[PDB]
Write a protein that binds this ligand. Structure first.
Ligand SMILES: CCC(CC)O[C@@H]1C=C(C(=O)O)C[C@H](N)[C@H]1NC(C)=O
Ligand SMILES: CCC(CC)O[C@@H]1C=C(C(=O)O)C[C@H](N)[C@H]1NC(C)=O
Ligand SMILES: CCC(CC)O[C@@H]1C=C(C(=O)O)C[C@H](N)[C@H]1NC(C)=O
Ligand SMILES: CCC(CC)O[C@@H]1C=C(C(=O)O)C[C@H](N)[C@H]1NC(C)=O
Ligand SMILES: CC(=O)N[C@@H]1[C@@H](O)[C@H](O)[C@@H](CO)O[C@H]1O
Ligand SMILES: CC(=O)N[C@@H]1[C@@H](O)[C@H](O)[C@@H](CO)O[C@H]1O
Ligand SMILES: CC(=O)N[C@@H]1[C@@H](O)[C@H](O)[C@@H](CO)O[C@H]1O
Ligand SMILES: CC(=O)N[C@@H]1[C@@H](O)[C@H](O)[C@@H](CO)O[C@H]1O
Ligand SMILES: CC(=O)N[C@@H]1[C@@H](O)[C@H](O)[C@@H](CO)O[C@H]1O
Ligand SMILES: CC(=O)N[C@@H]1[C@@H](O)[C@H](O)[C@@H](CO)O[C@H]1O
Ligand SMILES: CC(=O)N[C@@H]1[C@@H](O)[C@H](O)[C@@H](CO)O[C@H]1O
Ligand SMILES: CC(=O)N[C@@H]1[C@@H](O)[C@H](O)[C@@H](CO)O[C@H]1O
Ligand SMILES: CC(=O)N[C@@H]1[C@@H](O)[C@H](O)[C@@H](CO)O[C@H]1O
Ligand SMILES: CC(=O)N[C@@H]1[C@@H](O)[C@H](O)[C@@H](CO)O[C@H]1O
Ligand SMILES: CC(=O)N[C@@H]1[C@@H](O)[C@H](O)[C@@H](CO)O[C@H]1O
Ligand SMILES: CC(=O)N[C@@H]1[C@@H](O)[C@H](O)[C@@H](CO)O[C@H]1O
Ligand SMILES: [Ca+2]
Ligand SMILES: [Ca+2]
Ligand SMILES: [Ca+2]
Ligand SMILES: [Ca+2]
Lengths: 387, 387, 387, 387
């Protein structure tokens, strides 16, 4: 039966660790895919990890030059959550250097973008069958979430971007049914910039927290209903959510220009005027990670907060992060549970290796007792392939 | 329920990438079978990759001398599409140095030919159980499609060849039910030559596009109904489909003798007088690949064409190619969707290695937007086993 | 349907070997997790091996320093009984450096403790979904069974410990339903010490045999009904069950202070006044293993016994051991069958390696003929990674 | 539903190759168990390969000394037919240095013998649960078929041997239901010798062809009904079936003393007075293999034969062989199909290696066309571990 998506987010006081795959550590010997931009999504029966391979294994020569973002060798694959991404335990989804996926309760929808930078095509699959395609409309690296799409009442929603990553671009919202695009709309967002949206369902509507790679060290957001009637803005909190960023101070309801160039995929959960902010501990690089509750951070520019939970140490590598949800249909609860994953990036450019890859950790929001700590990657680089 | 096979091919304007396994790249470290002549076929529930192993893994000593076509060690195995062919994820089908397979909607039929060059026997299995055999009738390398057989209304059809590969030979059409041969007929084709047929269902009849290894740089074809009442001919288009071949010029409805010796397994899709032609970019070797639409190419000798889509670069290795279909029972469409796979051959004879193997890519025909590009093998030879 | 748990233990005259995975031997080449504290538990359909990984594979550099008990890299995983614990065949359960698991007949309950030594949190999962958490209440290494929890009539029971491991600590009994804690009680046990309880169901009540790490070379026990109304004591037999211990002599119904410091996880089965005692053959180190029937050993201090069966040779490595049961729902018997597993520890601290790991053997209680022998680990250390 | 076992063997004119796993070749790099005495057995849904591991992988140090027959490390495992026996694809059955297995249509029965030479115990499992045990009654290497047991009308039958392997011993027939021994009888066979019986069902009765290791270069046989009312004898044919043996001449209905010491596990199929004989091509060592039809060979001493089919070349390694059947319930036929497997032994004692292991091939009896050939192991010894 199709996910209803009409309940609100569950109240959350803390985050319980959900999984950790130790990919890099194990790939030191085992047969583990070189990967990046992993993410988690759940069917009514299980939770899977999606990832973009580089068509190579760790500690092999073909892992060389994997700093590179796009190529014909990259593919979208998935394995069970907490398991290592291996050729022996991973299912093939699509050929892609950018992707999204989500389960509407009936079947898996996957979105895989491949092809040249000036004419990339997104292939939509429903239950493993090609159901639709969309070609670049600006001919400049058509790209998408790199996390799960959001499903409500039999429809799945995603956001896509085409154009410059350092200037005004084009952003479109899609409504998809049975892997078929049934409605789309371009966002009227002059001076905004959207990348790698983390979108989730909440009371029959979708909320996306994204990445301003242009000129915003705070995060941009889009919320829309099933008819794609949307609203835009930036998270107001003085607790800046992007990386790099400036030290915490007074925030803005518009793009915070200071340290606003570049960025990293992230997320956040809106509760009334309050916000759950996941972010790196460092303001300059992709190190550490922490969850921060600002009861007034969604609409207020104050730099205060009530709660702060450690996820990854300040001196440890982190990277991308994104949201995923567990619907009532899966949990048996009467509300949509917020979860999140973190990508722990190892290798280039920060380390002396020929390769770049990441492992993952994940947490779920609970109202019972929790605790901070540091669950880092834990691999020792360089590897033998790098010597 | 059994596939009806009575709808016509879906109209197709372009080809969307469906899968890529990156076998050679991964086999550089992982435990991946040395293989060749792979192909794809679909049950009403999934799509699998079939392949002939050499009973050896890449980057191992036993991969040595794998240039050789036939031997007792070769076996027919299958794994899920897009996955690497590994001993840890592959299912054993049959002992074979030549094979075909297809699902009639109820169960898998596999055809595996093994034994000596002068008395090979084809073993038919239905749902993994031996249901029939056929021995060589000309005692000269009994061989078959190396791609999926075609199923219609509970019957599966294949084509087999016995005799010289550089002169007139013998070609038979078979009708098979529950893995049991219920009717066969010899093709009356003096001056024709058939090898490695790519056959597909279309409106209750079967169409096969094959390989004239004798004296034809254009492709031969056979079409028959369920009672094995057939027609033969050659694709007329001046867009020659085999390799090697001459530069494009005026074609023929008979075998184009020029550069007609040798060849490579290929395919094509007939739409009225028009044809979808898949072929290498090079006219001399197995490099590149492209899809070309000639609205008059099936029955006309003109060397014109409306559409051309790049699949593999001119300077990249290709190889065999073949068709497969997804029936309405699988897709939910009201027509039979045309798909195709390409074998990317690496190693001998063109490269300095002790071994020969291939990886695969696949596409499906869509009417939505698509794009050309190059999705090559991407491995760096020689391997460590070759040093 | 939920396990009834109301039948009594089956009479048992001997122990039949049930499984052996040969993990270390195979991990010498294969991709096998470095593990410790493994244990077995059964659903109404199968029996699985649970284990705590160190996030590393044998014969790899990351296996280094695995003597260490707790860290963020450790995870709870499971595979089918008798199979090697591998990334390619193991299912991920939870992030944990201490754990318990058990099936109530409907779904799997897993308990994974992670976090810092001064604030560890136990995460309860039911069917893979987080259902509850418990934080350390003494802020000193919250820890649990390291073996299966006990289920009766739809409720699962475990025992947890927080505080010193060399002095008085705090011990709590939990009642859990659908992975949700519905009742708990602190044990009033001054001068007792409980660690790593081996608990089993018997006639609608739970019996736990544990490890006094403080001052008892005989084993402590807890028995309670569904309402958590409990009794405590120590096994009286002069056949001391812990390691290290003194030579057999007159026992005590209280902690035997002599050689009472430290210990090792163990178990025992109560039959009236009699006891089935599993223990190391050595009184000083973790070598050998034997099953001993003392018809008066539960309540009597005599050092006599009727039956003695060899499991592991005196000069062979052993380690932890624990009980598991097979309910009538699984076996078809009208009684709860007692089984047990043994952890064969290799590496540090007793051997010259950088790593520490264990393999496992298991037996089931039968009333038919059996025999003693020695089923040791059988690996040759050091490994190549240690050179 | 339970196998009826009441139809007769299907008429067979030849043997079609069914599978080949290429284990040794692949284990040169892959993670493949060192094994010996493999065998095949079928459930109503699939056919599996059973084998005794040595608790080690090929090309690893622990494979050393695997010439040895019995040890605590050996285990009974199974994987799908034609697949390599790997820790990543094999299911654990039982701890054993001798075994049998068979499916009664409802569940798998496995028999695993382990323990010391002077008190071995056979553990019977039904659907993975221990259901019974039998201890050595002569205290001299209790051993069994090393091939599938035979099932008829809900009962499974096996033969076991205890005592000298070079003199008179003790042989018992067992009737087993739900893994529980319900009847047994000792064979009154003075001057006979039985080892490693290949037993099959035929018209509600069981026929076993075995190995006289004492003083018979022709094969001994036992046939019994469900009540264990039996008959004994030796295959009369002058086509001697054991190895070693003398050149073919006039046979005997008693043990052929000439070259009668030692032997090798084999099989044969009785059709009236005629016999299908599988045997090595060499009379002195375990090389080659061939199927021979002697229409009068069961009861006649003539050294004539009608049909001879090559399976393995004279100069290629062979080894054990055994029968297995596919019941009507599996095939849909109205008769029990005879199949057979061959073990291709590599390594010690005949080759310069530290290890010993085997791969397998299998065939099924058909009435359609077949052909002889040689499907050998195909590995190049020694391996790197042997250097
Ligand atoms: C093309 C712009 C885009 C967003 C800024 O770049 C991303 C940033 C990179 C990064 O900041 O880590 C990694 C992503 N793989 C890349 N996405 C693609 C499709 O290349
Ligand atoms: C026997 C003739 C046949 C068709 C020309 O050869 C094929 C060509 C070879 C090729 O051109 O690549 C490879 C095929 N493996 C081979 N088929 C067999 C059965 O050996
Ligand atoms: C923290 C005390 C506890 C019980 C004595 O230590 C155990 C003993 C160790 C041992 O004696 O082998 C190994 C266990 N992994 C360890 N448990 C934890 C959680 O660290
Ligand atoms: C114990 C006698 C027995 C039959 C002759 O030996 C067999 C012969 C050996 C052989 O001839 O190859 C291998 C078998 N693994 C062995 N069986 C056992 C249980 O050790
Ligand atoms: C939070 C919410 O709206 N829950 C609704 C519930 O009220 C309603 O009964 C059901 C449809 O019947 O869908 C769900
Ligand atoms: C590490 C490795 O695989 N080797 C090569 C390296 O020698 C070369 O300089 C580089 C060029 O791109 O690519 C890589
Ligand atoms: C909460 C909600 O949107 N309910 C919808 C209903 O409005 C819609 O008409 C129907 C179409 O299938 O699906 C359901
Ligand atoms: C293209 C085509 O012939 N489609 C047919 C449909 O008309 C028919 O109803 C059905 C059998 O009832 O089989 C299918
Ligand atoms: C690369 C390898 O495996 N080694 C051998 C090579 O030395 C030998 O000359 C050849 C002969 O066929 O076969 C191979
Ligand atoms: C479209 C078509 O061929 N329909 C066939 C029918 O003609 C045939 O008699 C029957 C036999 O099973 O199967 C169906
Ligand atoms: C040992 C025992 O108490 N067995 C009981 C049985 O008597 C009872 O009939 C059943 C519930 O009806 O539960 C079980
Ligand atoms: C065996 C190995 O992996 N190497 C290192 C070793 O050189 C180092 O001294 C030690 C320090 O903790 O950790 C490990
Ligand atoms: C033997 C036993 O405890 N039976 C219980 C019953 O007492 C209890 O009221 C019920 C609640 O679900 O479950 C069952
Ligand atoms: C060969 C043989 O005996 N076949 C029998 C068949 O005659 C009988 O009808 C059935 C039981 O009804 O069992 C089977
Ligand atoms: C090949 C190998 O693993 N090494 C040893 C070898 O050095 C030793 O002499 C032998 C003794 O049994 O066992 C093995
Ligand atoms: C052919 C045959 O033996 N049929 C048997 C029948 O004789 C027996 O009484 C029954 C017991 O379950 O099972 C069936
Ligand atoms: Ca930014
Ligand atoms: Ca040609
Ligand atoms: Ca103690
Ligand atoms: Ca003999």
């Amino acid at each position: 039966v199709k996910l209803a998506g009409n309940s609100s987010l569950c109240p959350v006081s803390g985050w319980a660790i959900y999984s950790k795959d130790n990919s890099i550590r194990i790939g030191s010997k085992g047969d583990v895919f070189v990967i990046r931009e992993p993410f988690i999504s759940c069917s009514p029966l299980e939770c899977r990890t999606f990832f973009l391979t580089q068509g190579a294994l760790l500690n092999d020569k073909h892992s060389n030059g994997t700093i590179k973002d796009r190529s014909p060798y990259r593919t979208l694959m998935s394995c069970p959550i907490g398991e290592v991404p291996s050729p022996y335990n991973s299912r093939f989804e699509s050929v892609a250097w950018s992707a999204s996926a989500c389960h509407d309760g009936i079947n898996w929808l996957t979105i895989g973008i491949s092809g040249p930078d000036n004419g990339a095509v997104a292939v939509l699959k429903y239950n493993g069958i090609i159901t639709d395609t969309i070609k670049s409309w600006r001919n400049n690296r058509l790209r998408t979430q790199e996390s799960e799409c959001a499903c409500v009442n039999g429809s799945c929603f995603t956001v896509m971007t085409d154009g410059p990553s350092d200037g005004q671009a084009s952003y479109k919202i899609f409504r998809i049914e049975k892997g078929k695009i049934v409605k789309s709309v371009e966002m009227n967002a002059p001076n905004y910039h959207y990348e790698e949206c983390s979108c989730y369902p909440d009371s029959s509507e979708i909320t996306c927290v994204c990445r301003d790679n242009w000129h915003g060290s705070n995060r941009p957001w889009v919320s829309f209903n099933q008819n794609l009637e949307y609203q835009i803005g930036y998270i107001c909190s003085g607790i800046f959510g992007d990386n790099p960023r400036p030290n915490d101070k007074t925030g803005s309801c518009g793009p915070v220009s200071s340290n606003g160039a570049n960025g990293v995929k992230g997320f956040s959960f809106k509760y009334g005027n309050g916000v759950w902010i996941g972010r790196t501990k460092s303001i300059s690089s992709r190190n550490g990670f922490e969850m921060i509750w600002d009861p007034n951070g969604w609409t207020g520019t104050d730099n205060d907060f009530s709660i702060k939970q450690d996820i990854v140490g300040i001196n440890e590598w982190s990277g991308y992060s994104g949201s995923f949800v567990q619907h009532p249909e899966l949990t048996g609860l009467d509300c949509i549970r917020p979860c999140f994953w973190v990508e722990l990036i190892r290798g280039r450019p920060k380390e002396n290796t020929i390769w770049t890859s990441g492992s993952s950790i994940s947490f779920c929001g609970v109202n019972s007792d929790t605790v901070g700590w540091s669950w880092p990657d834990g691999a020792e680089l360089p590897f033998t392939i790098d010597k």
